[PDB]
Design an enzyme around this catalytic site. Structure first.
Site, mmCIF file in Angstrom:
data_model
loop_
_atom_site.group_PDB
_atom_site.id
_atom_site.type_symbol
_atom_site.label_atom_id
_atom_site.label_comp_id
_atom_site.label_asym_id
_atom_site.label_seq_id
_atom_site.Cartn_x
_atom_site.Cartn_y
_atom_site.Cartn_z
ATOM 1 N N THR B 1 0.894 -1.191 0.000
ATOM 2 C CA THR B 1 0.000 0.000 0.000
ATOM 3 C C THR B 1 0.911 1.214 0.000
ATOM 4 O O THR B 1 1.905 1.283 0.721
ATOM 5 C CB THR B 1 -1.029 -0.033 1.153
ATOM 6 O OG1 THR B 1 -2.003 -1.051 0.878
ATOM 7 C CG2 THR B 1 -1.756 1.313 1.323
ATOM 8 N N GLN B 2 0.523 2.176 -0.816
ATOM 9 C CA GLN B 2 1.457 2.938 -1.609
ATOM 10 C C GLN B 2 0.702 4.181 -2.028
ATOM 11 O O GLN B 2 -0.529 4.186 -2.054
ATOM 12 C CB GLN B 2 1.809 2.139 -2.878
ATOM 13 C CG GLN B 2 3.045 1.251 -2.812
ATOM 14 C CD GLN B 2 4.063 1.529 -3.919
ATOM 15 O OE1 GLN B 2 4.043 2.580 -4.568
ATOM 16 N NE2 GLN B 2 4.967 0.579 -4.130
#
Lengths: 243, 233
Positions: B1-2
């Site tokens: 997750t970015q």
């Protein structure tokens, strides 16, 4: 005694007999050499033609590492392959972290430390190959030879296998007669000759010649195999010299 | 997750009779800041493939290193590395698609949309898309980002189905591509004037053009536009 039955045991003179026995397997292998030249290095090897049935040109023995390094070796072929696979992992990891391709001296120590590690324990066997390798980096050309003990040095020229002596003498003449340097195209020709000369000590079966090279000017500093016109041209220069 | 930081906008592409064209501008945005101006987002692989990448630039640079390591790896113990065992566009694509879907499946995506353009060894055109979800698809035209919304409709007027491909020349296709790039420069707030373009032809091989510019822009009609409704002066 029985000092020689287990790898990593010192004998009373201070030797590791298992490594010395690995050297015997190397001496029993086919001849291979490298010649350092003006701006590059040349590698060649004798491939015994066991039978009519081997497909000519299709059992390659010189191996590339990264894009700028050539490796050839004499002895147990699979051991040499295993060592080159490790060399490739070491080169990838250097490039990954540091961006620049691995310098040849740097690469030489990676192989050295790995080979030396296989003389530290009785649960592994030493490598049954001597390996000649090198290429071109930001500081020029480098040639190296590496023994089963993990011993390596930089060489002007190097040879190993059954014909190592004949080749060594031949290499010594070139070093004496060319103190200014040998050109890459020149070194390819000499390589063919010396493999032909050194084939004397192994003349049961006849052989197939294989050459490769890296030169700042002739291959742009990359490792490439010598085939086609340039191969035959050097085969002919060798033929000429044994007659 | 970015979350994507430094990003590249559209990548557009189409098939024509003998090959494929693909283009992408040279900008690396940092949100609304047009931060970096000489960014190459088309990456050639051998002499038969160009990989065009939008989205996160740090991940693009990672993908470059993957591709250049792929070339190295393919040359190993391969005497036919520059011939019958050279990397095909389809090999390069399947590898990238595999990676993209694995990374999305570990909830740590490569925040990109990718188009792989090239010519196979049998002369067939290759054009396929993959993105951060590992979704893949092929079409006579392909575009990412705003490109999907504004380029595809224009490029589809030229090649609207498979049978329009033999009827389309490299001059027609390049013109359509260059026009689409101008439109995107008019209308996409994260585009730049400067772009690169690459043609991969079964006869002429790979041509890679750098430092192209959007030209022939209509701005003159702007002088007549006054106010927002009732203002005359």
């Amino acid at each position: 005694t029985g000092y020689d039955l287990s790898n990593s045991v010192f004998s009373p003179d201070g030797r590791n007999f298992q490594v010395e026995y690995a050297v015997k397997a190397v001496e029993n292998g086919t001849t291979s050499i490298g010649i350092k030249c003006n701006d590059g290095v040349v590698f060649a090897v004798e491939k015994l033609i066991t039978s009519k049935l081997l497909v000519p040109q299709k059992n390659v023995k010189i191996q590339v590492v990264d894009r700028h390094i050539g490796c050839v070796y004499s002895g147990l072929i699979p051991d040499g392959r295993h060592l080159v696979n490790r060399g490739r992992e070491e080169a990838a990891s250097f490039k990954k972290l540091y961006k620049t391709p691995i310098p040849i001296p740097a690469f030489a120590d990676r192989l050295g430390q790995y080979v030396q590690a296989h003389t530290l324990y009785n649960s592994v066997r030493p490598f049954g190959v001597s390996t000649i390798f090198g290429g071109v980096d930001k500081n020029g050309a480098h040639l190296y030879m590496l023994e089963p003990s993990g011993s390596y040095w930089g060489y002007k020229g190097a040879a190993t296998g059954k014909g190592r002596q004949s080749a060594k003498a031949e290499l010594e003449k070139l070093v004496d007669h060319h103190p200014e340097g040998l050109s890459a195209r020149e070194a390819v020709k000499q390589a063919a000759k010396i493999i032909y000369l050194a084939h004397e000590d192994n003349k049961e079966k006849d052989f197939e010649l294989e050459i490769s090279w890296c030169s700042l000017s002739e291959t742009n500093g990359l490792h490439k195999f010598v085939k086609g016109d340039l191969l035959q041209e050097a085969i002919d220069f060798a033929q000429k010299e044994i007659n | 997750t970015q979350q994507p930081i430094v990003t590249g906008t559209s990548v557009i592409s189409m098939k024509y009779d003998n090959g494929v064209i693909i283009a992408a501008d040279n900008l690396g945005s940092y949100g609304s800041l047009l931060r970096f101006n000489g960014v190459e987002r088309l990456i050639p692989v051998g002499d038969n493939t160009v990989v065009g990448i939008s989205g996160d630039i740090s991940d693009m640079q990672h993908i470059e290193r993957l591709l250049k390591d792929l070339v190295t790896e393919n040359a190993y113990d391969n005497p036919l590395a520059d011939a019958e065992e050279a990397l095909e566009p389809s090999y390069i694509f399947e590898y990238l698609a595999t990676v993209m879907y694995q990374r999305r499946s570990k909830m740590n995506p490569l925040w990109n949309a990718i188009i792989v353009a090239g010519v196979q060894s049998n002369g067939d055109q290759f054009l396929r898309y993959v993105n951060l979800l590992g979704v893949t698809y092929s079409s006579p035209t392909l575009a990412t980002g705003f490109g999907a919304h504004m380029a595809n409709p224009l490029l589809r007027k030229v090649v609207d189905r498979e049978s329009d491909i033999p009827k389309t020349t490299v001059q027609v296709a390049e013109e359509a591509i260059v026009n689409a790039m101008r439109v995107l420069y008019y209308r996409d707030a994260r585009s730049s004037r400067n772009f690169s373009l690459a043609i991969i032809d079964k006869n002429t091989g790979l041509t890679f053009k750098k430092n192209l510019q959007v030209e022939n822009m209509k701005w003159d009609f702007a002088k007549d536009i006054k106010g927002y409704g009732t203002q005359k002066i």
